[model samples]
Target: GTSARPAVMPMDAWREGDKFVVEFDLPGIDADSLDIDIERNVVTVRAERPAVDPNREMLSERPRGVFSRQLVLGENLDTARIAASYTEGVLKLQIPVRKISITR
Candidate 1:
């Protein structure tokens, strides 16, 4: 295979008791360009980074493309009660765990 970087949107996910949190690292992306879509238990996060154009460019390391990431949540997570917020180039999603009926 050629020496090409893979398109990967870095993220971190963790569970906080009854709630789960997922944070994505997306710098230099406009807040308006971030979109979240939920279908059943699958959550999709999409963002776009505009291509940079300079007169006689020298160094270009940052990637410029549409980033789409999907997360398939299990039955324990509540999709309907998901909350999202973007702060400091990080997109955070809070998903509460589905409450189960307590049996005696």
Candidate 2:
């Protein structure tokens, strides 16, 4: 039984030259707890932000929970050799597009 669906995550995706790039804004998240898995043309990224001490809060507006998001890639892009990197609170991915094959 499914309890609750994962929250929708906002990301930016675009094509740059011969590769497609994707960026996710996830500030204040630990890199060790981030998980990136790819299966075929589907890529899933999950990040966890531990809950702070339950003492007293005066101002709290940031997300402090698990973040799971999936990106379905197209066949025009190469999913087997996708690259990922996390820097400055941003998770970035680069996937190269497949070369065209034309036979006369």
Candidate 3:
């Protein structure tokens, strides 16, 4: 039998005026594994944790696997201005309040 490690993630959400900022703690996860989707007033974030090395011996706590989280937005949120970045095992997401009506 194979034993699996549990996936853990901590998230924080706050509003800056009409915009909302969301941050998640996703250690050992890469940016490519994260997927973001926006539809109407709903925002979905799906992230998959890569498989651990089978050869490595488990000593202490072994944490691996995929993690996903979703968030709903209000009418004031601007879905078109969503941006995200991953740094130091933390995922930071920024959402703007107003949509850019014109782009130059």
Of the candidates numbered 2 and 3, which has the greater lDDT value?
A: 2
The CA-based lDDT of model 3 is what? 0.70
Give model 1's TM-score versus the native structure. 0.76
Clashing pairs in 2: none
List residue ranges in candidate 1 displaced over 4 A: 1-6, 54-59, 98-104
Q: Clash number for every model?
A: 0, 0, 0
Ranking by lDDT: 2, 1, 3
Model 3 lDDT per residue over 1-104, tens place: 11233344679988877657889987777667667655866876667766766787565464556665657656876667678888898888888875876877
**Prediction RMSDs, each to the true structure:** 6.0, 5.1, 9.3
Best by TM-score: 2
Q: TM-score for every candidate vs. truth?
A: 0.76, 0.78, 0.71
Cα shift from native, residue 18, model 1 (Å): 2.3
Question: Worst lDDT window (10 residues) for model 1?
Answer: 1-10
The local lDDT score (0 to 100) that residue 8 gets in candidate 1 is 57
Looking at candidate 2, the ten consecutive residues that score lowest on lDDT are 1-10
